[model samples]
Target: VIESPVDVVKELVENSLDAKATKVEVEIVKRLIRVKDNGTGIHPEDVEKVVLYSISSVSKFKLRSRFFQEKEGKEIEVEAGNILGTRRVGMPVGTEVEVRDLFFNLPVRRKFLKKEDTERRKVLELIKEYALTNPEVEFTLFSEGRLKKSSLKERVEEVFQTKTEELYAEREGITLRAFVSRNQRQGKYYVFINKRPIQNKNLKEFLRKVFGYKTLVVLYAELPPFMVVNILKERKFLELVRELAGK
Candidate 1:
């Protein structure tokens, strides 16, 4: 079992992030999957390759480690066996890695791949997840192939709402915000470093610690802009948070 639509959301969100999108939207109609993002928009020519086939370009900088260091200063120290430092690592600047890990990592899981309906559900879920963290980016979602649901509304009466007030209230000025639904069934914490979404566990834990005790809900967080810059420059703080998270 794929378990939930969240799984599909994870992949689509990763794709959007890889495309360097500031915001992404999702639409689901039965099993037809559609995701749109304001990011680079797939370069037009690369659309077929990216949408039909999974072609990955690895960044010359190891996002989780190397890139973090280069942005920081040389004064930053890296741990042994870890590539977290300002020292130049002679790797391609932006190389595309094959999407095998993302597409075929689990052989058994392939069996659950349903027809169009499943695909549509997964894609919609991804859009919802992105919207949660990227509330500031103006996101929208459509179901049944119709634009009935959207994150933004021009008219006050047309506004499609969520229970984000409580989470937003508590996180008025913090470097991050937690978006959790009242049911707790759907929610994600988006971690943005320098306006970029990163799957870094260290960052997630920091947000968690900050708001963990405030509510019993299992919270998901979205980092404020340039959060990666903060962690990269503050290696000690990053490591400390990572240690706390047991990452």
Candidate 2:
């Protein structure tokens, strides 16, 4: 059973992916948690398991690293013997983590959690990281019983609709854009590979070198989709890419 909001977020993210949603938004209001996604919305018939029970199907074979790499990239290293036991990438969206904190007993879970401000910050951090990884999708983070921030399309008409500057910044040779809302306060940058968010010093260093040391930038980036698959395969190439990217 899951006793915290973090576990809830994890399950929600899995569901979002399963639904083929390119973007997902999360909102926290007191004890109420709302997770919304633009993916294929839940089929009315499937709503029970999706919303209530933790059920999932095996992900498509294409999403598997060994299969994807062998089919798409010739550079991959895979042996037939090694392929038999490969595990899947990402969790099923419908998988449920039991919730232990009921709304009525607020004091129990509330006291154990970090300060309200800290919790909110962590939530935003998670949202920002996903936004970066899924640049094609629009994402938002709503908290403090309010709509805190939003990431919008890269156009003037769309820009005005949001509160913060677009999360991405463009430069002469390279474009450094964060999949974040210009309307939200800039927070620490986070990145995820597959369904897992991780901290890699190499990636951070790459960002520093590419962005330069003088700028006070707090930006997040996602490994490209192809790279995500590579990481899941336990390839050493990802570390090399991280070094090259200056993470």
Candidate 3:
């Protein structure tokens, strides 16, 4: 569910990545959040079909798309699960989604959120994780400025702000790659599965125990789609990670 501002940002960013976007820009201010991406825009036919607030769980949204079929674009606005109207707009061949007044209808939940500064940090961290995992995708978070699009190793250095060494291995059908550094507990450590930023406490503890504190760890694993369907719920994937970590 949309518990905080970061949740809203995370969903929109993930959507952009799913669309195969090469460039993504995220802007956030209080209750207003906007994510724009130069990915395959929402197709004309499914624009209406997919923007179902009731099913999508977003309170209000403005969606614009200039998909493959048209030179111009179409726009749709919805609030509290009701369609405001649809119109045409001129834009480039991509999508821009603006989310405003998040949780306005649910004041109880809105009041429970953390301070704006804390929420902003959470969002930035999320964006950084995504950027680290998807190095080829150019990600821009206005708050932290733009992340330079680069190769995986270079991206690790840029994001973590340190020198790192590479680790690579393969087992079964899974490939594990990492950029690691040691001796500083303040460094960033991350693990991604299939381009998805994931947190497995066991892996975290294992890395800490082995690498010691202040370790900079950015690891990504690629596996068959079938195994990733329930990454958190499945233990086989964890076992694979353990085997690779020991190796």
Find the candidate with the highest lDDT and give its number. 3
Candidate structures ordered by TM-score, highest first: 3, 2, 1
| Alpha-carbon local distance difference test for all models | 0.38, 0.42, 0.74
Clash totals for all models, in order? Answer: 21, 18, 2
Q: Please state the error at residue 168 of candidate 3 in Å.
A: 2.4
Error of 2 at 243 (Å): 10
lDDT of 1 at 101: 24
lDDT of 3 at 57: 35
Regions more than 4 Å wrong, model 2: 43-45, 50-110, 144-197, 202-211, 214-247
Give the better candidate number (1 or 2) by lDDT: 2
How close to the true structure is residue 231 of candidate 2, measured as C-alpha lDDT?
Answer: 45
Q: RMSD of each candidate?
A: 15.5, 14.4, 3.8
lDDT of 1 by residue, 75-126 (tens): 1222222334333333322212212122243345444556656666556545
Q: Which has the better TM-score: candidate 1, or candidate 3?
A: 3
Q: Mind giving the per-residue lDDT tens digits that candidate 2 earns over 81-186?
A: 1222223333323221222232233456555666667766666656655554544666655675442334444322232233333344233222333333322333
Query: Who wins the TM-score comparison?
Result: 3
